[PDB]
Symmetry: C6
């Protein structure tokens, strides 16, 4: 009854928990950017604005169209007020003989068209409420706000540059959460099926090789990467980064305990 267990050393890479690259869905010049790398932002914090002015005129243009139909209904309800008195007035001269039926029948039928009149316009006054909205959520597109809470990792698009998305979404800046990081470990295929979720594992960090970071694996990527023409596989675990220490692509020495069962005889 002896022992048998094996560890696998691997070179790993430290990465941010959540890493995003903000984009613009609109074209024009990036008027104002309000961050530089190092600024920490909240989720939904206005990160920058692209030239809205033309998307604003696109609103003037609409609301104005909304006042046009607004004075039309006011022409429908005038017809309605008239065609509705003429009605009664004759509905009355009816039991008194002074209109008969015909005239009365042609008077009530207008009465109805005039009714179906403010209805036509109103649906239009309604359709455009939705043409103003759709022309507004574009001005909600000139405001480049964040998709998550993190740190401004990089700004590939600076204040002053022009951005046209017509056929390719731009890349304004990129955020990333550093709190909890990640350690994509390179464990060759020659020994990945021995790598099982929930195993030990610890690592140093080149500069300062004696501080150690604990951590149990909890991930493995089905998608490999060839290195020198030798396929590997990332193995992952989580390590908290409450302070600065540990940055993007900071190398590491990973240690993993595949087997450890003790006393059974090899």
């Amino acid at each position: 009854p002896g022992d048998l267990q094996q560890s696998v050393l691997a070179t790993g890479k430290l990465d941010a928990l959540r890493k995003v690259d903000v984009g613009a869905q609109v074209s024009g010049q990036l008027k104002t950017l309000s961050v530089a790398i190092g600024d920490k932002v909240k989720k939904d914090q206005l990160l920058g604005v692209i030239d809205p002015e033309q998307a604003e005129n696109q609103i003037k243009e609409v609301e104005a169209t909304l006042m046009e139909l607004r004075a039309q209904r006011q022409q429908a309800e005038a017809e309605l007020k008239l065609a509705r008195v003429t009605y009664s007035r004759q509905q009355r001269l009816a039991q008194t003989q002074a209109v008969s039926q015909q005239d009365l029948d042609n008077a009530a039928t207008e009465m109805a068209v005039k009714q179906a009149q403010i209805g036509t316009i109103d649906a239009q006054i309604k359709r455009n409420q939705a043409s103003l909205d759709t022309a507004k959520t574009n001005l909600d597109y000139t405001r480049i706000v964040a998709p998550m809470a993190g740190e401004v990792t990089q700004i590939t698009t600076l204040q002053g540059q022009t951005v046209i998305a017509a056929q390719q979404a731009p890349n304004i800046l990129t955020l990333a959460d550093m709190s909890a990081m990640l350690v994509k470990a390179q464990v060759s295929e020659a020994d990945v099926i021995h790598l099982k979720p929930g195993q030990k594992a610890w690592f140093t960090v080149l500069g300062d090789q004696l501080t150690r970071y604990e951590g149990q694996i909890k991930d493995v990527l089905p998608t490999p990467e060839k290195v020198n023409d030798a396929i590997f596989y990332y193995a992952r675990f989580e390590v908290p980064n409450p302070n600065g220490l540990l940055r993007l692509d900071m190398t590491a020495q990973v240690h993993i305990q595949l087997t450890d069962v003790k006393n059974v005889l090899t």
Copy 2:
């Protein structure tokens, strides 16, 4: 003298997904929500992500509205339908006593006919736009990304928050992959390809499994080979079960194929 001829052939083959597909989008906008992770099994048609829809929602309201504008605008011609109708009648009666000639009888009778076509001119208006609504509804489907096949996310290209524009190149959200079975592309030489016939029995093992030999028969070859700098190689495929998780993508494999073995006969 009696004997037997037969020739083997080892081969450094590669291993990969029985079925793999890359799923994108036909609509622009930002990827507001993405519900799966780099390793979940999904069921077909399952929803994987949603793209900013506030827009298509805005097109719909603009189209429903239009229907209603025509919805009432018909209500109007439905009242005219009764004026030229009742009068027609009422004038057909007085007409038997001789009311305003026959000219007027026709004139007004064909007035009930014009007004009758006015309604259809409308009913069709709706139907058309009722068909535009589908076209507005339909794009609302193109905002939500659903898994076209069942498998496990082999990767996630377009993250959650990133912004896609589909006008040029359809984006790439997350590749799926049926790993149920795994084809193994044994890369044989163009000097052996000459032989090798469908269903020919072959075995192979992975570099890290030592001896746990796997095996079956070959299923075909791919007409389109590919050169590894020198030497033209082809691919002789495989169909082996991949339960128990094992067999990861592009995992290497040492294959051996058994060209032929006609034994005991004039050689």
Copy 3:
């Protein structure tokens, strides 16, 4: 009276007679593909279909527009029926004095407008027959059928993937005829003008170097290709491939007999 003739060995490449790469002219998701590599298809066999549904709504939308004008003519011919009786009725009360000319002249002129009326609409009922057709041959564009009869050489676009052609035609799959193949032979410039259409030539095939394939050249490509920084030229001939043997880019040893005239003394 002796002899003089020379042969030129060259490395050649075997290729398919006709090789095509099917494309889509429409965007959307490729719903169904009905072939894998190895499937042999007939010319005009439906190879696959991209999401038609929206190109279908594009039809509902039109036919409906075709019923609209269809009830309009039905409003033109009602006017016509009326304005054509009023005519006669007065054409008659004419020789009887009851209308004179004026009225009659204004009655015949309507008679004509009403005529030119069903004509206006009809041309419209006709224009749209051609708006339905044009909106239909697009639904004839969701059906990716073959441009020739061959073998599915490769499928670069698989079932499930999205295809948008707006600014670049996609590549669904590629077919190729293998019956008769081709052998683009590499015969250097140092000796191409000696290479003449109709000359001998034979070749082996690496794996199995003793089976020989006959064939007289019948082609030569004016367009060269540099190799190691040395310009060559393809020379061609046809060889039938009734069976499997011989694949795309399968190497070969080509032999060519430029001269052979015998007995004249060098």
Copy 4:
């Protein structure tokens, strides 16, 4: 025994613009005129180039015109406004003596109301197009290229005469650069990055200045490092004045940073 620990760290850093930006265009057309040279200081908003505007000039004239078509088309409804008005009045008077009932009084009084709405239906027409004019005017701004920041033209990509098309990729006319100050990106090792804290005093010199040492403190680091084939390096930045012209872009610099120097104490 008492002592002191402290560790230096030299570093081959690089030097560059405190502020740099690349200026393009949102409109196509040919670059008819470009007013600056590969080395002039500009003031903000200064005009650098103009793109062929004959077109936007043509859109404006088409829109002003439209305003005028509505400008007169209102003048018409302004005369109707007086017919239904004066009559209304004049019929209210005769009405007290009993002119054509009350039916006609209303009918014509509400005629002055319909005609009254006709004007607004117009005034709004204008206002809309008065807002289209801004949209036509606004693009006329997008033809003239103005300097978004003050500095000196570090380069000129799009020459004068060349023709740009902005529909895909926004072009690139001339990069500007504030050289007032110059950041120096000391590329330190990922094995030293561990240390190095904001404001830490450091000195450096250029390869051609021999000894004229420059110095200050570090301002930060960039979270996104970058590998030089091997070894992961980061960038510790600088803020030094660059008067007297010196310090050109990407000019090399030999940096030394002073990690720490706690002296006299238990080590």
Copy 5:
């Protein structure tokens, strides 16, 4: 002492098409038919291929139709033209006896004038669309690919069946090439380029022709040279007949140029 100076200069030149051009298309659709092969001589304007036209055929029918809708819609105003005309007349006659004042005479006479303008409002409608028809007809030309110059197909990029989309990059169907004559770009050194003057007599042979020397004079140089990793080279061109098929593209040639030869004189 009397003598003579003169310096030669050999040069590894290259050979190619006197005239070459790449022919594409302005319209999308699939290449339904392609009538030439990788080596046929064509005549100018000859038809080489056709792109799926069912569409432009559909635009035409939609435009001819429109003409007809206006073709009849005029036939209507041509009957009104006779009502206000005959009445005018007939009312001018009765008018001399004093029919319905003069007011009505004018009113109806100017009615023959309004109706008269109605026709023109139409005739112009047609003419416009008669010009749209050309625009519809014209695109039908852009479906058939015709040879812009006479020569022989040096290549075929876009095959028959492949599908082209012209919206971004104009495709490439089949390059043509006038091989009648062949320019030979002798690549001379930037240290010799100094000399070399138009029309300067030079000879050359191909690597496989041994000795069958070809020769003429140089025609020019190209202002834009090109480096072969090191050494800046220019191109001194040639104009030699290429009958009997010989001289293929990019075929190599050993050129010798004769800088100068002023003989017998004070050197």
Copy 6:
């Protein structure tokens, strides 16, 4: 009181004073090109034409629309002629009692609408003058003329080829002025701050190393270029090229005199 001064040798490059690459803003086939490399052109000389024919139909289409409104005004002024006589005629039967006021008031008000009538149309007859112009300066876009006076350096786009600019401006040909050339000299960073505008400098030209070209520097580029992974800087001066001598990218040996002050003792 001795001396001290230093020169810096550098490899330089000769370039053209002004170098442009002509573009097209229109798509279609390049019908005619009227230059080959070596042709010297004047500023605004028609360099080539792309297929105008469709941009021409775009005019027929417009002028025709300009005749439509042209016969409309002719319908407005007929109404005007009528509604303006009826006016007077009653303005007169006014002081004679035969119209009163009402009728007169309804007659003058038409009189005004008819006035505001030729005005409506006229503004339209005017708007289109600007729709014809805008549709004309596009036919001014089928004529590829020069942006400066120089020499046809290169023709990347030849007669016969198709050019579509939709999403990328093409490159027809490139001109360049050779009169006065330029000599971008490579003077390393190790010694650029010693390089001062207005200093001596002379250079040879490989082929023929004894003819010398004088020239004082008058330029320096803030933007460097790495060579072998060593950053340099261009230094410039002007040299006239009245003849052929000196071409694009013709190498040179540059000489520069940074310091020269004499007699002060080192």
